[PDB]
Amino acid sequence: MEIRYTPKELTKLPRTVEYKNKSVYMINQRLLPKEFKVEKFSKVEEVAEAIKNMTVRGAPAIGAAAGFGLALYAETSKAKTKEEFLDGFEKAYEILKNTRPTAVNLFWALNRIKKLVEEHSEDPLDEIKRLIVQEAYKIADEDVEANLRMGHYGAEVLPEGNILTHCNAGSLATVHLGTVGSVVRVMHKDGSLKLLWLDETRPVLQGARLSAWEYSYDGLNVKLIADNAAAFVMQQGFVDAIIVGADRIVANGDFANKIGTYMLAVLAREHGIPFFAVAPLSSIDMELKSGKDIPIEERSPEEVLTCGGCRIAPDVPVYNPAFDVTPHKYLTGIITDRGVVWPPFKRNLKKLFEVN
The residues carrying an active-site annotation are 247
In angstroms, how far is CA 9 from the centroid of its own chain?
A: 20
Shortest reach from residue 31's CB to a copy of itself, in Å? 12
DSSP state of 33: T
Torsion of CA 208, 143, 349, 322, to 10 degrees: -30
308 is in an annotated binding site: no
Closest CA to 350 of 295, 306, 284, 300: 284
Looking at 50-58, 186-194, 318-326, 331-339, which segment touches a copy of itself (CB under 8 A)?
318-326
In the shown chain, the binding pattern of residues 4 to 23 toward a copy of itself, with x for contact by CB under 8 A and - for none, equals --------------------
User: Which residue lies nearer to a copy of itself by CB, 89 or 262?
Assistant: 262
Residues 192-231 that bind a copy of itself (CB under 8 A): 197, 199-203, 205, 208-209, 212-213, 216, 222-231
- 312 belongs to the binding site for a copy of itself (CB under 8 A): yes
Cα–Cα distance for residue pair 207/200, rounded to 1 Å: 4
Show the CA angle centred on residue 102, arms to residues 100 and 107, nearest 5°.
80
231 is in an annotated binding site: no
Cα–Cα distance for residue pair 338/279, rounded to 1 Å: 10
149 is in an annotated binding site: no
- 232 belongs to the binding site for a copy of itself (CB under 8 A): yes
46's CB contacts (< 8 A; 6+ apart) are 24
236 is in an annotated binding site: no
Show the CA angle centred on residue 112, arms to residues 111 and 117, nearest 5°.
90
Shortest reach from residue 185's CB to a copy of itself, in Å? 17
Interface size with a copy of itself, residues (CB under 8 A): 56
100 is in an annotated binding site: yes
Q: Which residues pair with 341 in a beta bridge?
A: 334
- In the complex, the residues that contact a copy of itself under the rule CB under 8 A are 33-34, 197, 199-203, 205, 208-209, 212-213, 216, 222-233, 235-236, 258-260, 262-263, 266-267, 270, 296, 304-314, 316-321, 324-325
